[PDB]
Design a binder for this molecule. Structure first.
Ligand code: SF4
Ligand SMILES: [Cl-]
Ligand SMILES: [Cl-]
Ligand code: NI
Length: 728
């Protein structure tokens, strides 16, 4: 592995950009000096052994943990590392020395930021929303699933200042509509806030802060290799290769240059991210394909996307509102809502329906009834959405799948909002979207264009009708409810036993190459979004896609759930690292995890049972670890007996770790997680004979966070797991 080979042709000897290299050298010396003095002052004040670190991460100082592997825990640990980084800054003006200076600048910024967080407590925070500062592991994991399928095509690290706030808003709205994840640093943030651009973790656009806070992009990106990629800490070239091949990041260096910013950009180049600046560059301050100037703001985004290799697929319908992943998570407050439909205020439904060739005119979008200019701001209308689909290869069992997509298609619109499903949908449109000209016809055109782009193989013609008359919507809701009942009846017939074929899912191998998911009718994929029916429809739509049938054959262990067919498939598709997999236990040959699991279960021998912790829970767990620390062990595609990543719904399955004792073996979950699943937990517990009140016997963080606090509660509740056989 020779990662440096990627740089081979950038600069032919005798024509080194000595202005750039000397500015990089001065900036690296300056950053390491800043860090040296701050570290010496901090060690004098707090003492060498004083702990240092970042909130809510399993990877200590992730930049150092990835590139050199040290487990920085205290101020003392930083001292040798910085010394080494200072030693590798060399006077000679070569591209290799410049990349080493950029690595040293990244190390210095990471050290300076950890020292900054020495003063940080969650209740005396040094940063407040929308600013992020250091971004916790759960956010990285929460967006990993959008990364693996390139719903997020890439990342833009924007440092400095746009020529003015309006240019900042233009390029950032453009990037947000292309779905790129943004890291913002310095005065660009205040420029965007003055223009009322939406920023924050919910919009996948992180305002890190200023100055050394830029490093919080780097320690974010490197964690992707430490998590999903399973790369060992300290494998420097392996981490750089993972970044170059999979983290499609680039830097936009806007505004007046200064030496420390240039050295940080050189560290980005050191790990394979090109830099594009809006400044004019003399020939001796540029590197082809690595440090380049695009002064014209009309071109800078496509210039960076082309040099990085990012390919964007856009629907190219002139929507009056921005559209993309950043807006999926938005919330429209009552004060900002122009109109709403459903959610128990007006009657509502949505339905996809396969139709014959006779029936439909492709591209026809019709609004039948009053449009949203009908009402005063804050008003309401009925809405019934009917998407008729004819296709040669269309099937009725695709109807629910495509219907599921409606939610997402709606939420990506800026100022469009959607929740629930079927006849319980709740839809909202903001005053801003209305002021831009958005009307119901644009929602229908959006649904049409997205369905055409996403399922070309099976939709030959698509038509969209939006009814807003109250009694007509009430009439059509009955037809939709017939379709829903047939779908529920088809789903009821599926069991692990009744079906002869389970389905693989390899979608996450783009970031977790060794990980293989096996979806069965009673075990959803650990991301929680890929059901057995979903994977089956995806394979029938794309036979050579990442979901494949696997027959249930070669049974080895009916109890733990081991079959030769799944073992073989897994061994072949895990690169011969994983030989066996039990479907019904976590204690022996558990299914592996990539890193996007909704929750983690772990066996606690002292309580004779399982703890479960979801990604959103902040707090210690009785195993003595947080969710992030546990995910550091459970993810990365290695087999971890006694630990397993799962989707939340899987807790309600009849096959839920059935060999281990199922729900009866669960002794601890977060309160909010139990409330999220209370209904299915009560139903399944009554089915098992545990009683509907069994949920009250499960300990939570209000009971305690250690074995010593939790065991007495389980003893006083008579929890059955205490009388069950120890698992191991
Ligand atoms: S089913 Fe497994 S492999 Fe597929 S997207 Fe979900 S977590 Fe990733
Ligand atoms: Cl000093
Ligand atoms: Cl150490
Ligand atoms: Ni994952």
């Amino acid at each position: 592995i020779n990662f440096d080979q990627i740089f081979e042709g950038a600069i032919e000897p005798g024509k080194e950009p000595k202005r750039l290299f000397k500015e990089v050298y001065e900036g690296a010396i300056t950053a390491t000096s800043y860090a040296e003095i701050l570290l010496s002052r901090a060690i004098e004040k707090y003492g060498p052994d004083h702990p240092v670190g970042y909130p809510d991460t399993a990877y200590f100082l992730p930049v150092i943990r990835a590139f050199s592997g040290e487990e920085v825990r205290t101020l003392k640990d930083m001292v040798p590392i910085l010394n080494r980084m200072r030693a590798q800054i060399k006077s000679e003006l070569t591209f290799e020395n410049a990349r080493l200076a950029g690595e040293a600048t990244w190390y210095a910024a990471e050290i300076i930021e950890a020292l900054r967080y020495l003063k940080h407590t969650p209740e005396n925070p040094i940063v407040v929303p929308p600013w992020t500062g250091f971004i916790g592991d759960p956010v990285v994991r929460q967006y990993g699933i959008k990364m693996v399928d390139w719903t997020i095509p890439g990342e833009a690290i924007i440092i400095g200042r746009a020529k003015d706030s309006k240019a900042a808003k233009k390029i950032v709205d453009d990037l947000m509509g292309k779905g790129l994840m943004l890291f913002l640093c310095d005065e660009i943030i205040e420029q965007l806030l003055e223009e009322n651009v939406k920023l924050g973790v919910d919009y996948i656009a992180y305002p890190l802060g200023n100055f050394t806070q830029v490093v919080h992009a780097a320690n974010y990106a490197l964690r992707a290799g430490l998590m999903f990629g399973g790369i060992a800490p300290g494998l420097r070239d392996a981490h750089r290769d993972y970044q170059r091949r999979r983290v499609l990041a680039f830097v936009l260096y806007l505004g007046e240059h200064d030496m420390v910013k240039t050295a940080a950009a050189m560290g980005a180049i050191f790990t394979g991210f090109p830099v594009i600046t809006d400044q004019p560059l003399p020939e001796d301050k540029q590197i082809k394909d690595w440090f380049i100037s695009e002064p014209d703001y009309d071109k800078i985004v496509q210039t960076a996307l082309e040099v990085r290799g990012i390919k964007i697929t856009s629907i190219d319908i002139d929507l009056p509102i921005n559209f993309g992943p950043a807006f999926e998570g938005e919330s429209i407050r009552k004060g900002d809502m122009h109109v709403e439909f459903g959610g128990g205020k007006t009657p509502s439904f949505e339905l996809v329906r396969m139709v014959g060739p006779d029936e439909i005119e492709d591209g026809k979008v019709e609004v039948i009834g009053p449009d949203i200019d009908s009402v005063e701001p804050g008003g309401r209308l009925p809405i019934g959405i009917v998407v008729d689909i004819y296709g040669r290869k269309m099937q009725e069992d695709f109807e629910p799948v495509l219907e599921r997509r409606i939610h997402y298609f709606t939420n990506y619109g800026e100022g469009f909002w959607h929740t629930a499903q079927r006849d319980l949908t709740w839809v909202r449109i903001s005053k801003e979207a209305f002021a831009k000209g958005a009307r119901l016809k644009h929602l229908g055109q959006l649904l049409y264009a997205k369905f055409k782009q996403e399922f070309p193989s099976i939709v030959d013609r698509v038509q969209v009708t939006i009814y807003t008359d109250e009694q007509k919507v009430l009439e059509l809701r009955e037809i939709a409810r017939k379709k829903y009942a047939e779908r529920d009846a088809r789903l009821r017939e599926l069991s692990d036993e009744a079906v002869d074929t389970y389905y693989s899912c390899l979608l996450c191998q783009s970031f977790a190459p060794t990980h293989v998911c096996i979806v069965s009718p009673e075990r959803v994929g650990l991301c929680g979004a890929i059901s057995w029916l979903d994977a089956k429809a995806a394979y029938e739509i794309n036979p050579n896609g990442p979901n494949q049938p696997i027959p249930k054959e070669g049974l080895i262990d009916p109890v733990k759930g081991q079959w030769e067919s799944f073992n073989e498939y897994i061994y072949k598709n895990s690169q011969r690292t994983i030989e066996r997999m039990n479907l019904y236990t976590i204690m022996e040959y558990p299914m592996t995890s990539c890193g996007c699991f909704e929750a983690i279960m772990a066996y606690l021998p002292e309580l004779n049972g399982f703890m479960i912790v979801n990604r959103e829970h902040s707090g210690m767990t009785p195993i003595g670890m947080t969710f992030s620390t546990l995910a550091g062990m459970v993810g990365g595609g290695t087999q971890t007996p006694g630990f397993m990543g799962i989707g939340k719904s899987y807790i309600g399955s009849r096959k839920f770790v059935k060999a281990d004792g199922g729900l009866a073996r669960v002794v601890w979950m977060p309160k909010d997680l139990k409330e999220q699943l209370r209904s299915i937990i009560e139903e399944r517990a009554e089915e098992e004979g545990l009683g509907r009140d069994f949920i009250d016997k499960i300990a939570d963080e209000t009971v305690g966070t250690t074995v010593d606090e939790v065991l007495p509660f389980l003893e006083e509740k008579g929890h059955p797991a205490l009388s069950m056989e120890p698992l191991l």
